[PDB]
Every structure is written in C-alpha cells, then in structure tokens.
Scaffold this active site. Structure first.
Site, PDB file in Angstrom:
ATOM      1  N   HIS A  44      -5.453  -0.156   0.620  1.00 16.99           N
ATOM      2  CA  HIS A  44      -5.902  -1.496   1.004  1.00 16.99           C
ATOM      3  C   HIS A  44      -7.179  -1.456   1.841  1.00 16.99           C
ATOM      4  O   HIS A  44      -7.840  -2.478   2.017  1.00 16.99           O
ATOM      5  CB  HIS A  44      -4.793  -2.257   1.739  1.00 16.99           C
ATOM      6  CG  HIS A  44      -4.604  -1.858   3.171  1.00 16.99           C
ATOM      7  ND1 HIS A  44      -3.904  -0.726   3.546  1.00 16.99           N
ATOM      8  CD2 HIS A  44      -4.980  -2.464   4.328  1.00 16.99           C
ATOM      9  CE1 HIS A  44      -3.857  -0.653   4.865  1.00 16.99           C
ATOM     10  NE2 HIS A  44      -4.507  -1.688   5.363  1.00 16.99           N
ATOM     11  N   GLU A  84     -11.623  -2.931  14.111  1.00 17.99           N
ATOM     12  CA  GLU A  84     -10.504  -3.500  14.915  1.00 17.99           C
ATOM     13  C   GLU A  84     -10.255  -2.784  16.246  1.00 17.99           C
ATOM     14  O   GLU A  84      -9.643  -3.360  17.148  1.00 17.99           O
ATOM     15  CB  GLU A  84      -9.183  -3.614  14.144  1.00 17.99           C
ATOM     16  CG  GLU A  84      -9.320  -4.102  12.726  1.00 17.99           C
ATOM     17  CD  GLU A  84      -8.331  -5.181  12.352  1.00 17.99           C
ATOM     18  OE1 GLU A  84      -7.099  -4.997  12.583  1.00 17.99           O
ATOM     19  OE2 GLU A  84      -8.803  -6.216  11.821  1.00 17.99           O
ATOM     20  N   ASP A 127       0.870  -1.183   0.000  1.00 19.39           N
ATOM     21  CA  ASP A 127       0.000   0.000   0.000  1.00 19.39           C
ATOM     22  C   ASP A 127       0.905   1.232   0.000  1.00 19.39           C
ATOM     23  O   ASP A 127       1.324   1.729   1.047  1.00 19.39           O
ATOM     24  CB  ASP A 127      -0.946   0.010   1.215  1.00 19.39           C
ATOM     25  CG  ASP A 127      -2.039   1.093   1.125  1.00 19.39           C
ATOM     26  OD1 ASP A 127      -3.084   0.974   1.820  1.00 19.39           O
ATOM     27  OD2 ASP A 127      -1.865   2.069   0.374  1.00 19.39           O
ATOM     28  N   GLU A 164       0.395   2.895  12.937  1.00 23.03           N
ATOM     29  CA  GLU A 164      -0.531   2.563  11.908  1.00 23.03           C
ATOM     30  C   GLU A 164      -1.600   1.658  12.552  1.00 23.03           C
ATOM     31  O   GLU A 164      -1.379   0.449  12.777  1.00 23.03           O
ATOM     32  CB  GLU A 164       0.169   1.934  10.712  1.00 23.03           C
ATOM     33  CG  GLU A 164      -0.507   2.405   9.380  1.00 23.03           C
ATOM     34  CD  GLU A 164      -1.637   1.563   9.096  1.00 23.03           C
ATOM     35  OE1 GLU A 164      -2.748   1.890   9.514  1.00 23.03           O
ATOM     36  OE2 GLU A 164      -1.408   0.487   8.538  1.00 23.03           O
TER      37      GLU A 164
HETATM   38  N1  LIG Z   1      -2.716  -3.606  21.520  1.00 17.49           N
HETATM   39  C1  LIG Z   1      -1.657  -3.916  20.736  1.00 17.49           C
HETATM   40  N2  LIG Z   1      -0.397  -4.031  21.302  1.00 17.49           N
HETATM   41  C2  LIG Z   1       0.698  -4.367  20.524  1.00 17.49           C
HETATM   42  N3  LIG Z   1       0.540  -4.553  19.154  1.00 17.49           N
HETATM   43  C3  LIG Z   1      -0.679  -4.430  18.582  1.00 17.49           C
HETATM   44  C4  LIG Z   1      -1.797  -4.132  19.354  1.00 17.49           C
HETATM   45  N4  LIG Z   1      -2.857  -4.082  18.517  1.00 17.49           N
HETATM   46  C5  LIG Z   1      -2.441  -4.355  17.256  1.00 17.49           C
HETATM   47  N5  LIG Z   1      -1.081  -4.575  17.293  1.00 17.49           N
HETATM   48  C6  LIG Z   1      -0.189  -4.909  16.160  1.00 17.49           C
HETATM   49  O1  LIG Z   1      -0.207  -3.777  15.334  1.00 17.49           O
HETATM   50  C7  LIG Z   1       0.155  -4.088  14.005  1.00 17.49           C
HETATM   51  C8  LIG Z   1      -0.709  -3.229  13.086  1.00 17.49           C
HETATM   52  S1  LIG Z   1      -0.364  -3.398  11.305  1.00 17.49           S
HETATM   53  C9  LIG Z   1       0.874  -2.057  11.159  1.00 17.49           C
HETATM   54  C10 LIG Z   1       2.258  -2.695  11.095  1.00 17.49           C
HETATM   55  C11 LIG Z   1       3.435  -1.713  10.927  1.00 17.49           C
HETATM   56  N6  LIG Z   1       3.545  -0.674  11.984  1.00 17.49           N
HETATM   57  C12 LIG Z   1       3.274  -1.013   9.613  1.00 17.49           C
HETATM   58  O2  LIG Z   1       2.965   0.187   9.629  1.00 17.49           O
HETATM   59  O3  LIG Z   1       3.475  -1.636   8.549  1.00 17.49           O
HETATM   60  C13 LIG Z   1      -0.019  -5.595  13.905  1.00 17.49           C
HETATM   61  O4  LIG Z   1       1.251  -6.198  13.720  1.00 17.49           O
HETATM   62  C14 LIG Z   1      -0.638  -6.052  15.242  1.00 17.49           C
HETATM   63  O5  LIG Z   1      -0.081  -7.251  15.700  1.00 17.49           O
END
Ligand SMILES: Nc1ncnc2c1ncn2[C@@H]1O[C@H](CSCC[C@H](N)C(=O)O)[C@@H](O)[C@H]1O
Length: 311
Positions: free
Chosen positions: A259, A118, A16, A109
């Site tokens: 996405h 979510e 993305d 993100e």
């Molecule tokens: N409460 C929480 N504590 C720690 N990690 C979390 C969380 N909720 C979601 N995540 C993690 O957050 C990620 C979001 S996807 C974003 C991934 C990365 N920062 C990027 O920008 O490409 C996922 O890997 C998920 O496992």
C-alpha cells in the site's frame, strides 16, 4: 489521525498481505521473542499485532492508540477472548500513563510513504527510550531507503504536458506547481533504468530522531541508455534481532506491490543517460518545518537542485 479513526485506512493496511503477513510470520515463527514477555504495541489500530503477540504467548500486551479506532480494538480483543492478556490504552504514546514501567518488546507498524512520511518513527523512538527494558527489543529493527532512476517519457507527459493546452488555453505555469509534489504510485518495473542505490540505513535500536534528518550522496548505475524523467524512492524492512526465522519485505518496484507503493520525484528537466554510466547526485531528507509530519526531499542531479514535498 482522525483519518486513522476510519475503517478504510485499516482495511487497506490489513488487505496489504505483504505487510501484514510479514509481521505475522515474524511473530509466529519467533515465539521465543514473545513467550511470557510484556509487549508494547505502539499505535495498535484494530489490535491485529497485539493479537499476534498474544497468540505467540505474550504474558501481557499493551495496545496503545490515540485514534477512536482504539474502541474497536477493545471489542475486537474481547470477541477473540484475549482480554485477559491484551490491555487497550487510549492516548498518544508520548503522553499516556502506562500501567507498567518497562516492557520487554516493542512492536509497531509506523512506516509511511518513503519510510519517513508522517514521522511515526519519532513516536516509536520515544516509547523505546522511555519504556524499553535494558536488553529489550524493538521491531522491525532494521530499515533502509533506496533510490532508483526511472525513464517514462509518456507518463511524464501525461502528467506535466497536460497543462500546455487545456480546452484551448495555455496553463503551462502549472508545471511549476506539479513538479514539487512527490507522487505515490506503483511503478512499471520495465521503466527502471538504473540499479538501486541505498541512501539510508536505520538501526531502530540505536538511531535517534536526529538521525532521521539526513543527506546522502548516491550513484545510480544506468542499465539502459535512455532518458531519465524521474527518481523513485522506496524502503526495505527487516526483522532480525534474536530471530532464527528472519523476515524481510521490500516496497520496491521489483517486488509485489504494497500500500506504500513507491514515491516518485518527477524531474523538471529530464536528461539522457547511457548504459554502464555512474549517475551521481545528492539527496537531503528533512521534516517540513511547519508540519513535522510532512517531508521535504531535495534532489541534486545533472546540475540542478529541486525540493519536493510529501503531502
Ligand atoms: N503517537 C501516537 N500514539 C498513539 N498512537 C499513534 C501515534 N501515532 C500514530 N498512532 C496510531 O498508529 C496507528 C498506525 S496504523 C497501524 C495499525 C495497526 N498496528 C496495524 O498494524 O494494522 C494508527 O491507528 C494511529 O492512530
């Protein structure tokens, strides 16, 4: 978030380009925000954002992830020789011990379909309230959600009217099961029949999880006499605070697809509409009471009310 343990989801986010280049341009074009600062990357995934921060001159970056993807992040960070700046921490942000008490900057993100699906903003807000130093900043900092009226009778029919004759049998009662499931898809901008209407403004610095449960009146200014078959939702993301080079991206149908695509609430009963008309209605967005990660979105329009679920 076993799902977030798999390469596919990360591959899709990294592919993305609108999304990833927006966070990159924000960080790279505003290094003063990051230089010599302590940064927290909530949900670091592969560590992509934490590495952007490091390259912009962060003194210390804590990448936190609950998923097994964190272990790849560790190896990724070492591969790029960034292990003297970026630490990886395995666990939920709302329960891990962090080796610091405050951070200067939170980056994340967190956005889902229709922005809030979510409920990951809850987790960012937790980190913000517990760890953000007085005077610190959280990014992206401003977020908005808009609705737009759609007319696509043929698409409506492909999905809904499908159930009327299936291999010779009536299955029309299935329509009642179809309507309530919000669809995530990219909309043909040709099928847009109103101007957009903002339904929510979020300031990530001062908002509370309480504010993420909300009602909004909306008016759609119809631009095309036709028939309304659906309402679509989308969101815009802003990087503003302390920025000389301000960054925005949209996930609307008028913009390059992301996405997140668009979220589409099909109308049980489509209805006619005239160019210039001001179409009035109400939307309510609440967490699904059984699963707070799921959304319930209630649309009132043309004298009918319908509740939709985002998975
Ligand atoms: N409460 C929480 N504590 C720690 N990690 C979390 C969380 N909720 C979601 N995540 C993690 O957050 C990620 C979001 S996807 C974003 C991934 C990365 N920062 C990027 O920008 O490409 C996922 O890997 C998920 O496992």
């Amino acid at each position: 978030f076993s799902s977030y343990g798999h390469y596919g989801i990360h591959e899709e986010m990294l592919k993305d380009k609108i999304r990833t280049e927006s966070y990159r341009d924000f960080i790279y074009q505003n290094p003063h925000i990051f230089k010599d600062k302590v940064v927290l990357d909530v949900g670091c995934g592969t560590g992509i954002l934490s590495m952007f921060a490091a390259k912009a001159g962060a003194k210390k970056v804590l990448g936190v992830d609950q998923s097994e993807i964190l272990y790849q992040a560790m190896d990724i960070i070492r591969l790029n020789k960034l292990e003297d700046t970026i630490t990886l921490i395995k666990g939920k942000i709302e329960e891990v011990h962090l080796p610091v008490e405050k951070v200067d900057v939170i980056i994340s993100e967190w956005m889902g379909y229709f922005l809030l699906f979510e409920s990951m903003l809850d987790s960012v807000l937790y980190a913000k309230n517990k760890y953000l130093a007085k005077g610190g900043s959280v990014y992206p900092d401003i977020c908005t959600i808009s609705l737009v009226a759609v007319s696509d009778v043929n698409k409506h029919a492909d999905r809904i009217a499908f159930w009327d004759d299936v291999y010779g049998f009536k299955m029309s009662c299935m329509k009642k099961a179809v309507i309530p499931e919000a669809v995530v898809e990219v909309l043909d901008p040709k099928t847009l029949i109103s101007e957009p209407c903002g339904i929510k403004h979020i300031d990530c610095h001062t908002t509370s999880i309480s504010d993420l449960e909300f009602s909004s009146d909306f008016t759609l200014k119809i631009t095309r006499t036709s028939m309304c078959t659906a309402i679509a939702g989308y969101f815009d993301i802003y990087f503003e605070k302390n920025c000389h080079n301000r960054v925005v991206f949209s996930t609307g149908p008028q913009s390059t697809k992301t996405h997140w695509k668009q979220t589409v609430f099909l109308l049980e009963k489509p209805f006619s509409v005239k160019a210039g008309e001001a179409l009035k209605g109400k939307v309510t967005v609440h967490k699904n009471k059984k699963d707070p990660r799921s959304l319930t979105v209630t649309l009132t329009l043309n004298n009918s009310t319908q509740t939709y679920g985002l998975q």
